[PDB]
Amino acid sequence: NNHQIQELESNVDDLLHQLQLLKEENNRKSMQISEMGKKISDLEVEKTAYRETLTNLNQELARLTNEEQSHRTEIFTLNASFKKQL
Amino acid sequence: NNHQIQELESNVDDLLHQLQLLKEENNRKSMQISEMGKKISDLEVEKTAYRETLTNLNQELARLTNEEQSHRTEIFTLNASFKKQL
């Protein structure tokens, strides 16, 4: 008819626009995925740094409190053993 | 010519295939972005949990070591002050 060519013109125009917009999206998404991949690696090693220091300091803390305790006990035993002789 | 219609047939076929493959990519990427967004939030709060415990235990550790030190000093001062009278 008198419309049959103008039909494809507009259609082709659309496909080629959409495929512009989508190649654009795919690009913005590839970039965001790169940046998020890096953020994940960074957070993972920062989490590991805090965890490993936490567990190391927990061990020292256990060690000290166990000492402060055995020392606190021994000084109470001697101080009662003092007044029982005196 | 005798080629001019078969030309668009194959072309249109391509655009419509590519736009299939790209709508597919955009979908796989939207999903991966969702999962990475969540992983980032999870790692951020796990990092915070380790950091806040680390800083709390560091304070207790400082407190103990300062005590164990003032106690260790005082018991050396008294023990030298002992043998100087005796």
From Swiss-Prot, chains A, B:
Cell location:
Preautophagosomal structure membrane; Vacuole membrane
Q: How is it modified after translation?
A: Acetylated by the NuA4 histone acetyltransferase (HAT) complex.
Functional note: Involved in cytoplasm to vacuole transport (Cvt), pexophagy, mitophagy and nucleophagy. Recruits mitochondria for their selective degradation via autophagy (mitophagy) during starvation, through its interaction with ATG32. Works as scaffold proteins that recruit ATG proteins to the pre-autophagosome (PAS), the site of vesicle/autophagosome formation. Required for ATG9 anterograde transport from the mitochondria to the PAS. Also recruits the ATG19-prAPE1 complex to the PAS. Required for the Cvt vesicles completion. Plays a significant role in life span extension.
The similarity annotation says:
Belongs to the ATG11 family.
Q: Any extra detail in the entry?
A: Present with 86 molecules/cell in log phase SD medium.
What does the record note on quaternary structure?
Homodimer and potential homooligomers. Interacts with ATG1 kinase. Interacts with the ATG19 cargo protein transporter. Interacts with the ATG34 cargo protein transporter. Interacts with ATG9. Interacts with ATG17. Interacts with ATG20. Interacts with ATG30. Interacts with ATG32; to recruit ATG11 to mitochondria. Interacts with ATG36. Interacts with YPT1.
Q: What is this protein called?
A: Autophagy-related protein 11
Q: Which gene carries the instructions for this protein? A: ATG11
